[PDB]
RNA sequence: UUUUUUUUUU
């Protein structure tokens, strides 16, 4: 049984005043723990802090238009006040009211901006669709609530949906049920299985069978042999997804269940798409295995909806599947409406036979109407049987699937509480991008083998709480395990994405010179526009500009960098007209206001069609993805006060390692020198002749110089 | 040295 009581968490959350900016005892995170008690004492307050800051952010950011509810009933359940309330069905569907949402119920008309009004924090417990109404079961804290005497039956209130706490509930569930985990010892001690050394012959055999390099084959062999935690660190372009697919085939060699998880839906979708192509066992046989995606069809790729469990169950139930009775009733009533005036006229004119016939027809129509009305009154048992058939179909589909892919929170769904399933082996992708409690979620189903593919050198998980991030809540389990046992981590050491000039600096400065380029990589990234000196594989443009707060005091904008980016795109496109660039260019900037300004100006000049040829994004919203050419706007321009979160080397590495063929960086050096590694990058660009300064708008206004003929020979 | 930034939710 792995269903802990959610009373404590719900009470802690419902005992909050919404009007504060922004309990508990938040401490630092240790490397190891002796007992689940210490683990809980460390991580529960940090979870509460993260939840609190997420709630404040969602309150300030939400824009759900309020709506009126009618209080139908009030009850006391546990230590909570339960209020059933009626809501219009269309309003409910528009605002998406489901079980677990956090809402503000107020008496005033604008609840979000009326603290002095009768307000309360409530959690949705059940949503029941009747006909044109929705019965919502709100649950609030029964200790100290202003609206408690005012929620009498019939009283009307105004509600606004703030956020949802399903993810928090699942992470708390995993936290409280950790004490029964098969891998509890390894999770507490952060101890992965020891590094295995294999013979070069078996390594070469795996390489030949799966078309892998030595590091990937070593990682796969250690994932097949070792039990417990196996850590695989995959720098950019090292082949993480290919390794995972070959590893899934390798583990299923015997079977021919396996739970592949990722923190985001995008990574899950990529893994599903790659596993749909098919795996191959170590025997060398190609098998099109059964890949099953778990999640709602709204956050799921259009290409993987063919293998989504929900879609499969819906398709199966659509074959087994009162309104015709209503149609016939309408038609018989129309016949009655026809017959009645005819009968009245035949009776008002002393027409014996005609009135007799019409009365006979009238009586037959009334008989049919009574029959249809009796049948209409004839469930709910059919609905229950449909739900039972749904459950059966779910189980039957799950039992035939060999690999199940999911998000971390999605793998802790309530569904599995009524489905007999165990996941012996779990592979967590993007292992360094999720907090520890999220990683623990898929491990409650009897997992004794966990392969963590990640990269702590890139971005950490989103921790809105600056205090919890300072306490160490932004540390993934991967990071702690590698912190304690670094020699047991399998590093993928060969990248196949960046031109050697692009990868040169990150490899040395972030991967200790251990990230080597693949064979024939410079020749693979050879592009025609590299013949232009200023359009080479890698370059830093010292765009001396000025930073400025975005609209509504958002983030930062550098209009000169936007102008230079437009000028660079114009020069490149004009000097190379015959190159198909659709989907080959990306423009990334770590500040959202600069991103919006870049998109705005590019659409002003080139129209909305420009977004099909250029991927506009922020540095954080680009991880895992890549483009042929990357224009990187640094935005920061104030020579004092630092460069903000530009100082974090993980974000810098992510931003530098997105490009394949060309990376063109635009930054005001006078400000960026404040950061140590940005200074090192600018100096490196200088001492290798990849730095350009002066009037950049003028240097890009004309077609620029070409590279020497002798350099192209080599 | 003024975090302003991202995942998650049947
Ligand atoms: N041994 C290899 N030889 C040649 N190319 C490889 C090898 N391993 C990986 N690659 C290339 O690297 C790519 C890795 O894809 P992906 O897993 O998305 O990279 P990332 O590690 O950035 O997620 C593959 O598409 C493949 O073309």
The structure tokens 């169950």 sit at A313
The tally of CA atoms less than 13 A away on the side-chain side of residue A415 is 19
Encode A626-662: b = buried (16+ Cβ within 10 Å), e = exposed: bbebbbbbbbbbbeeeebbebebbbbbbbbbbbbbbb
- For residue A241 and ligand 1, the question of a CB distance below 6 A is answered with yes
Q: With respect to residue A607, please indicate whether it lies within any of the assigned structural domains.
A: yes
Residue whose C-alpha is closest to residue A161's, from A72, A114, A95, A100: A95
Instruction: Identify the burial level of A532 via C-beta atoms within 10 angstroms of its C-beta, where 0-12 means exposed, 13-18 middle and 19 or more buried.
Output: middle
- Rounded to 5 degrees, what are φ and ψ at A245? -65, -50
Residue nearest to atom 18 of ligand 1 (CA): A241
Helix intervals (H) in A239-351: 240-251, 265-277, 309-320, 323-347
Q: Are A664 and A631 in contact (CB under 8 A)?
A: yes
The structure tokens 């027809």 sit at A361
3-state secondary structure of A629: strand
> Crossing angle, helix A240-251 and helix A265-277, to 10 degrees?
60
Q: Are A523 and A713 in contact (CB under 8 A)?
A: no
A331 and A275 share one domain:
no
Tokens standing for residue A370 = 């009574």
* C1’ B8 / CA A708, Å: 51
Q: Are A665 and A541 in contact (CB under 8 A)?
A: yes
- Rounded to 5 degrees, what are φ and ψ at A519? -70, 135
> Distance (Å, rounded) from C-alpha A616 to C-alpha A77?
50
> Distance (Å, rounded) from C-alpha A67 to C-alpha A387?
31
Residue A296 contacts strand B, CB under 7 A: yes
* C1’ B9 / CA A432, Å: 21
Tokens standing for residue A19 = 């009007």
A9 and A86 share one domain:
yes
| Chain B: bases < 7 Å from a protein Cβ | 1-10
Q: With respect to residue A396, please indicate whether it lies within any of the assigned structural domains.
A: no
Instruction: Give the helix/strand (H/E) hosting A38.
Output: helix A36-61
A53 and A38 share one domain:
yes
Residue whose C-alpha is closest to residue A47's, from A39, A36, A35: A39
Q: Give every CB contact of residue A207 below 8 A, 6+ residues apart in sequence.
A: A213, A214, A216, A217
Full DSSP string of A414-460: GGGGGS----SEEEEESGGGS-HHHHHGGGGTT--EEEEEE-TTS--
A538 and A658 share one domain:
yes
A172 and A219 share one domain:
no
Residue whose C-alpha is closest to residue A465's, from A477, A478, A475, A474: A474
Displacement of CA A560 from its chain's centroid (Å): 34
Tokens standing for residue A401 = 């699937």
Residue A647 contacts strand B, CB under 7 A: yes
A120 CA to centre of ligand 1 in angstroms: 52
* C1’ B9 / CA A58, Å: 13
Displacement of CA A377 from its chain's centroid (Å): 46
Output the CA–CA distances (angstroms, integers) from residue A473 to A30, A243, A458, in the order listed: 11, 29, 16
A505 and A597 share one domain:
yes
Output the CA–CA distances (angstroms, integers) from residue A232 to A82, A119, A206, A257, in the order listed: 48, 50, 17, 21
Tokens standing for residue A615 = 């991927």
Displacement of CA A282 from its chain's centroid (Å): 33
Residue whose C-alpha is closest to residue A560's, from A694, A655, A642, A666: A666
3-state secondary structure of A247: helix
> Crossing angle, helix A559-575 and helix A592-606, to 10 degrees?
40
A189 φψ region: left (φ > 0), alpha (ψ -120 to 50), beta (else)? alpha
Experimental method: X-ray
Residue whose C-alpha is closest to residue A222's, from A213, A234, A230: A230
A300 and A443 share one domain:
yes
Minimum-distance residue to B5 (CA–C1') = A620
DSSP designation for A498: S
Output the CA–CA distances (angstroms, integers) from residue A367 to A187, A336, A337, A462, in the order listed: 73, 11, 15, 68
3-state secondary structure of A322: coil
Displacement of CA A617 from its chain's centroid (Å): 16
Q: What is the dihedral of CA A694, A697, A702, A704, to 10 degrees?
A: 50
> Distance (Å, rounded) from C-alpha A98 to C-alpha A92?
9
Residue A302: how many other CB atoms lie within 10 Å: 8
Residue whose C-alpha is closest to residue A405's, from A586, A574, A245, A212: A245
3-state secondary structure of A482: helix
Ligand 1, residue A495: give the atom nearest the CA.
12
> Distance (Å, rounded) from C-alpha A161 to C-alpha A82?
17
Q: What is the dihedral of CA A84, A87, A93, A96, to 10 degrees?
A: -50
> Distance (Å, rounded) from C-alpha A563 to C-alpha A565?
5
Helix intervals (H) in A81-150: 89-95
Residue whose C-alpha is closest to residue A297's, from A307, A289, A285: A307
Residue A328 contacts strand B, CB under 7 A: no
3-state secondary structure of A45: helix
Residue A166 contacts strand B, CB under 7 A: yes
A111 and A188 share one domain:
no
A682 and A657 share one domain:
yes
Q: Are A146 and A116 in contact (CB under 8 A)?
A: no
* C1’ B2 / CA A267, Å: 34
Q: Give every CB contact of residue A543 below 8 A, 6+ residues apart in sequence.
A: A558, A560, A561, A564, A666, A667, A668, A696
Closest nt to residue A555, judged CA to C1': B4
* Strand locations in A492-530 (E): 494-495, 516-517
Residue A462 contacts strand B, CB under 7 A: yes
Q: With respect to residue A393, please indicate whether it lies within any of the assigned structural domains.
A: no
Q: Are A499 and A471 in contact (CB under 8 A)?
A: no
Q: With respect to residue A46, please indicate whether it lies within any of the assigned structural domains.
A: yes
The structure tokens 């202003």 sit at A146
Tokens standing for residue A187 = 């999770």
Displacement of CA A537 from its chain's centroid (Å): 32
A305 and A202 share one domain:
yes
Number of domains forming the structure of chain A: 4
Q: What is the 3-state secondary structure (H, E, C) of A522-580?
A: HHHCCCHHHHEHHHCCEEEEECCCCCEECCCCCCEECHHHHHHHHHHHHHHHHHCCCCC
3-state secondary structure of A359: helix
Q: With respect to residue A424, please indicate whether it lies within any of the assigned structural domains.
A: yes
Residue nearest to atom 9 of ligand 1 (CA): A239
Q: What's the CATH code of the domain at A102?
A: 2.40.30.170
Tokens standing for residue A179 = 């004490």
Displacement of CA A703 from its chain's centroid (Å): 43
Residue A451: how many other CB atoms lie within 10 Å: 27
DSSP designation for A259: E
Q: What's the CATH code of the domain at A607?
A: 3.40.50.300
Vertex A430 angle, CA A61 and A275, to 5°? 115
Residue A62 contacts strand B, CB under 7 A: no
Ligand 1, residue A212: give the atom nearest the CA.
1
Encode A317-334: b = buried (16+ Cβ within 10 Å), e = exposed: eeeeeeeeeeeebeebee
> Distance (Å, rounded) from C-alpha A436 to C-alpha A533?
47
Residue whose C-alpha is closest to residue A700's, from A589, A592, A564, A590: A564
Tokens standing for residue A683 = 């100096």
Residue A192 contacts strand B, CB under 7 A: no
The structure tokens 């660190």 sit at A233
Instruction: Give the helix/strand (H/E) hosting A231.
Output: strand A228-233
Tabulate helix, strand, coil % of chain A (nearest 5).
45, 20, 35
In this structure, are strands A133-141 and A80-88 parallel, antiparallel, or unpaired?
antiparallel
Vertex A708 angle, CA A703 and A709, to 5°? 115
Q: Choose the final residue of a domain: A123, A149, A179.
A: A179
Q: Choose the final residue of a domain: A472, A492, A512.
A: A492
First-to-last alpha carbon distance for chain A, in angstroms, is 66
The structure tokens 């993980």 sit at A650
Beta bridge partners of A659: A627
Tell me the residue range of the domain where A368 lies.
Answer: 323-378
Helix intervals (H) in A140-256: 166-177, 184-189, 200-210, 214-225, 240-251
Q: Are A33 and A39 in contact (CB under 8 A)?
A: yes
Tokens standing for residue A703 = 């077609």
> Distance (Å, rounded) from C-alpha A437 to C-alpha A4?
15
Q: Are A451 and A425 in contact (CB under 8 A)?
A: yes
Q: With respect to residue A394, please indicate whether it lies within any of the assigned structural domains.
A: no
A250 and A238 share one domain:
yes
Q: Are A102 and A123 in contact (CB under 8 A)?
A: yes
> Distance (Å, rounded) from C-alpha A175 to C-alpha A181?
10
Q: Are A584 and A534 in contact (CB under 8 A)?
A: no
- For residue A213 and ligand 1, the question of a CB distance below 6 A is answered with yes
> Distance (Å, rounded) from C-alpha A323 to C-alpha A329?
10
> Distance (Å, rounded) from C-alpha A16 to C-alpha A62?
18
Q: Choose the final residue of a domain: A492, A507, A531.
A: A492
Tokens standing for residue A529 = 């526009």
- For residue A242 and ligand 1, the question of a CB distance below 6 A is answered with yes
Tell whether the torsion through CA atoms of A447, A448, A453 and A454 is positive or negative. positive
- For residue A271 and ligand 1, the question of a CB distance below 6 A is answered with no
> Crossing angle, helix A36-61 and helix A166-177, to 10 degrees?
180
3-state secondary structure of A59: helix
A503 CA to centre of ligand 1 in angstroms: 15
Q: Are A275 and A288 in contact (CB under 8 A)?
A: no
Q: With respect to residue A327, please indicate whether it lies within any of the assigned structural domains.
A: yes
- For residue A644 and ligand 1, the question of a CB distance below 6 A is answered with no
Q: With respect to residue A237, please indicate whether it lies within any of the assigned structural domains.
A: yes
A369 and A304 share one domain:
no
Tokens standing for residue A396 = 């039957």
Residue whose C-alpha is closest to residue A666's, from A575, A550, A581, A545: A545
3-state secondary structure of A385: helix
> Distance (Å, rounded) from C-alpha A628 to C-alpha A334?
68
> Distance (Å, rounded) from C-alpha A629 to C-alpha A581?
9
Residue whose C-alpha is closest to residue A595's, from A632, A570, A564: A632
Tell whether the torsion through CA atoms of A609, A614, A620 and A626 is positive or negative. positive
Q: Give every CB contact of residue A303 below 8 A, 6+ residues apart in sequence.
A: A269, A273
> Distance (Å, rounded) from C-alpha A113 to C-alpha A391?
44
> Distance (Å, rounded) from C-alpha A115 to C-alpha A136?
24
Q: How many residues does chain A have?
A: 714
> Distance (Å, rounded) from C-alpha A349 to C-alpha A495?
99
Q: Are A196 and A222 in contact (CB under 8 A)?
A: yes
Resolution, expressed in angstroms to one decimal: 3.0
Output the CA–CA distances (angstroms, integers) from residue A432 to A183, A347, A478, A653, in the order listed: 19, 89, 6, 14
Residue A439 contacts strand B, CB under 7 A: no
């Amino acid at each position: 049984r792995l269903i802990p009581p959610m009373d404590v968490l719900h009470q802690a959350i419902l005992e909050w005043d919404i009007f504060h900016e922004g309990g508990y005892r938040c401490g630092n995170v240790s490397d190891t723990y002796p007992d689940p008690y210490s683990y809980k004492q460390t991580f529960f307050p940090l979870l509460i802090n993260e939840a609190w800051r997420s709630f404040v952010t969602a309150k300030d950011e939400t824009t759900s238009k309020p709506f009126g509810i009618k209080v139908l009933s009030r009850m006391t359940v546990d230590k909570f006040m339960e209020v059933t309330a009626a809501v219009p069905a269309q309003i409910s569907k528009d605002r998406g009211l489901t079980e677990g949402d956090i809402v503000i119920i107020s008496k005033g008309e604008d609840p979000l901006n009326q603290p002095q009004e009768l307000h309360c924090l409530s959690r949705i417990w059940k949503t029941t669709y009747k006909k044109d109404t929705v019965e919502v079961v709100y649950r609030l804290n029964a200790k100290g609530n202003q609206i408690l005497p005012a929620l009498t039956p019939g009283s009307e209130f105004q509600v606004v949906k703030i956020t949802n706490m399903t993810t928090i509930e699942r992470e708390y569930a995993a936290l409280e049920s950790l004490q029964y985990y098969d891998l509890m010892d390894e999770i507490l001690k952060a101890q992965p299985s020891p590094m295995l050394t294999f013979g070069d012959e078996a390594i070469k055999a795996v390489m030949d069978n799966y078309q892998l390099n030595p590091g990937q084959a070593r990682a796969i062999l250690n994932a097949k042999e070792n039990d417990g935690f196996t850590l695989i660190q995959g720098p950019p372009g090292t082949g993480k997804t290919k390794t995972i697919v070959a590893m899934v085939g390798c583990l299923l060699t015997g079977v021919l269940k396996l739970l592949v998880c990722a923190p985001s839906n995008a990574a899950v979708d990529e893994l599903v798409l790659r596993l749909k192509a098919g795996v191959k066992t170590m025997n060398g046989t190609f098998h099109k295995i059964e890949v099953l995606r778990l999640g709602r069809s709204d956050v799921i790729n259009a290409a993987v909806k063919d293998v989504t469990l929900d879609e499969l169950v819906k398709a199966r139930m659509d074959a087994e599947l009162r309104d015709q009775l209503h149609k016939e009733a309408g038609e018989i009533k129309a016949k009655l409406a026809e017959i009645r005036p005819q009968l009245d006229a035949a009776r008002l004119s002393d027409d014996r036979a005609s009135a007799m016939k019409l009365q006979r027809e009238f009586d037959e129509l009334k008989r049919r109407q009574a029959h249809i009305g009796a049948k209409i009154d004839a469930g709910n048992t059919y609905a229950r049987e449909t739900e039972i058939k749904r459950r059966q179909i779910q189980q039957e589909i799950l039992d035939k699937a060999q690999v199940l892919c999911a998000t971390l929170s999605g793998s802790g769904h309530e569904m599995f509480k009524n489905l007999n399933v165990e996941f012996e082996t779990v592979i967590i992708d993007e292992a360094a991008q999720c907090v520890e409690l999220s990683a623990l979620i898929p491990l409650k189903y009897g997992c004794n083998k966990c392969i963590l593919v990640g990269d702590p050198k890139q971005l950490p998980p989103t921790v809105l709480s600056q205090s919890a991030a300072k306490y160490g809540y932004d540390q993934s389990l991967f990071v702690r395990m590698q912190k304690n046992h670094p020699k047991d981590v399998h590093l993928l050491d060969m990248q196949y994405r960046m031109h050697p000039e692009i990868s040169r600096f990150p490899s040395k400065e972030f991967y200790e010179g251990l990230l080597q380029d693949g064979a024939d990589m410079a020749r693979l990234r050879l592009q025609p526009w590299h013949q232009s000196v200023l359009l080479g594989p890698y370059r830093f443009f010292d765009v001396k500009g000025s930073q400025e707060r975005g609209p509504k005091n958002q983030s930062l904008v550098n209009e000169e960098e936007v102008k230079v980016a437009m000028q660079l795109y114009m020069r490149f496109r004009s000097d190379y007209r015959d190159i198909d660039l659709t989907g080959k260019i990306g423009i990334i900037t770590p500040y959202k206001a600069q991103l919006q300004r870049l998109r705005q100006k590019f659409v002003e000049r080139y129209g909305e069609s420009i977004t099909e040829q250029i991927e506009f994004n922020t540095t954080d919203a680009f991880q895992g993805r890549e483009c042929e050419i990357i224009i990187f706007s640094c935005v920061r321009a104030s020579p004092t006060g630092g460069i903000g979160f530009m100082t974090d080397i993980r974000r810098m590495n992510v931003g530098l390692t997105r490009a394949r063929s060309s990376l063109w960086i635009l930054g005001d050096s006078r400000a960026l020198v404040q950061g140590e590694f940005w200074a090192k990058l600018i100096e490196d660009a200088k001492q290798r002749d990849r730095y350009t300064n002066g009037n950049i708008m003028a240097l890009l206004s004309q077609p620029g110089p070409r590279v020497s003929l002798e350099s192209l020979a080599k």
